[PDB]
Amino acid sequence: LQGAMQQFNQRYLYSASMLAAENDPYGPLPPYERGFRWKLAHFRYLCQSNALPSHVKINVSRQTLFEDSFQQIMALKPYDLRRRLYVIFRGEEGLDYGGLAREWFFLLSHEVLNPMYCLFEYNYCLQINPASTINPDHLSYFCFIGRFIAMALFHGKFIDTGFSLPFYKRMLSKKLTIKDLESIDTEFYNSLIWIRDNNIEECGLEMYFSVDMEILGKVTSHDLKLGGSNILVTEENKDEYIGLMTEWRFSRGVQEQTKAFLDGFNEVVPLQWLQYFDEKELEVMLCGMQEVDLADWQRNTVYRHYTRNSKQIIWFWQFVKETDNEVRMRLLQFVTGTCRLPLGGFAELMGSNGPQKFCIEKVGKDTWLPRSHTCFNRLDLPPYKSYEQLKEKLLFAIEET
């Protein structure tokens, strides 16, 4: 876990500006844009204005960190988690000046992935496991992870493992789109788009407004509307079916765990305080910024119907070499779905289905906007006619929510 730590603290140094708070509420002095730095600054003023005096003790032994933290975080009243965090590592070194709590958040965000609690699949990716019910108390563990995550946001602390963009979208209660499903289940997504596009009453297919899932062998059949199991998907109603199926796929097998996480979060940091962030900003707020190395990225990128020498590839690397780091990370999220980089850099980039390098493919014509497939870390780049056209389209597309 040591290599992850060095990279962890280094993100704390790159990201210091993220701890700045607005001074007054009255605005800059005079000498649509997303306004991230200012939303972050106003969020910190909000938490800081809502901090409570004194502290809560958190007393952990390293060899037993998760269970001890679970016990002690769960027994504190939720709003007592807005006092100062004071963490002691039992019989070890000195006192918490803030530094041991940074350690604690780092170690906790990793210790939660330990297989013996069965909460998550399999790393820095948290995907809730449907079979988490194996653990009879998994609902109370998810509350704790909800409280633990809010505490980090409240206290301006980072964690080294995060959820996926569509998950943070439900956490900000944004309407999930079918393009989001592509990011979570491409086969399910292909079949939804197939149904939408082709005649079902001439394929002879027969589907019903009901869907089923299999968890540790036990199959359970959920109805998408009243009577849906007897209702036939026809040419007339297949748009509704696609809608309810998209919604249902985002939390399949994990509805209960997700409510236990959200409610635990909401008790510490009301979800409303986040309403103006988007899911990419929320993701960065939890794990920090890092500098994005352009050289490693460029030599581990792969092209479909483009080359090193296509003029749009040249323009793309010129766009990247000349934008700020905050823009490079946001393009990283557009294309890969995360701001995080694997330990081994871009040569080790991974897709949902095994290894997959950052990929740029030529599709369509000059009038199209850029599209992403985050599951295959593939950027669909139209053959634009000029650098300025490329810059403006790529900029509009990484910024679009």
Residue numbers in the entry: 430 to 460, 543 to 633, 638 to 916
Quoted from the paper:
The Nedd4 family E3s have nine members in humans (WWP1/2, Nedd4/4 L, Smurf1/2, NEDL1/2, and Itch), which share a common N-terminal domain architecture comprised of a C2 domain and 2–4 WW domains that are responsible for subcellular localization and substrate recognition, respectively. Each HECT-type E3 contains a characteristic HECT domain at its C terminus, which catalyzes the transfer of ubiquitin from E2 to itself and then to the specific substrate. The HECT domain adopts a bilobal structure, in which the E2-binding N-lobe is connected by a flexible hinge loop to the catalytic C-lobe. To prevent excessive ubiquitination of targets and self-destruction by autoubiquitination, HECT-type E3s normally adopt an inactive state characterized by intra- or inter-molecular interaction.
To elucidate the molecular mechanism governing WWP1 autoinhibition, we determined the crystal structures of WWP1 in its fully inactive (2L34HECT) and partially active (L34HECT) states at resolutions of 2.3 Å and 2.5 Å, respectively. In contrast, the presence of the adjacent WW domain(s) together with L (e.g., 2LHECT or L34HECT) led to dramatic decreases in WWP1 autoubiquitination, suggesting that both WW2 and WW34 are responsible for ligase regulation. Both 2LHECT and L34HECT mutants possess slightly elevated ligase activity compared to 2L34HECT, indicating that they adopt a partially active state. In the L34HECT crystal structure, WW3, WW4, and the entire L region were well-resolved. It seems that the WW3 and WW4 domains are packed closely together, WW4 binds to the same “Le” site on HECT, and L forms a kinked α-helix that resides at the same “H” site that spans from the “Re” site to the “Le” site. Compared with 2L34HECT, WW4 and the N-terminal part of L are rotated ~35 and 25 degrees, respectively in L34HECT, and a few N-terminal residues (aa 413–416) in L were not observed. Importantly, although the 35 degree rotation of WW4 and 25 degree rotation of L appear to be significant, the crucial WW4-HECT and L-HECT contacts in the 2L34HECT structure are preserved in L34HECT. Our assumption is that the WW4-binding N-terminal extension of HECT is a flexible loop, which allows HECT-bound WW4 to rotate a certain extent upon crystal packing with a symmetric molecule in 2L34HECT; whereas the 25 degree rotation of the N-terminal part of L is the result of the missing WW2 domain and crystal contacts. We further validated the functional relevance of the WW4-HECT interaction in L34HECT. The point mutation at the WW4-HECT-binding surface (H517AWW4 or Y543AHECT) severely impaired the WW4-HECT interaction. Meanwhile, mutations at the WW4-HECT packing interface in WW4 (E503A, H517A, and H517Y) or HECT (Y543A, Y543E, W549A) led to significantly elevated autoubiquitination of WWP1 L34HECT, further demonstrating that the crystal packing-induced rotation of WW4 does not affect its inhibition in HECT activity.
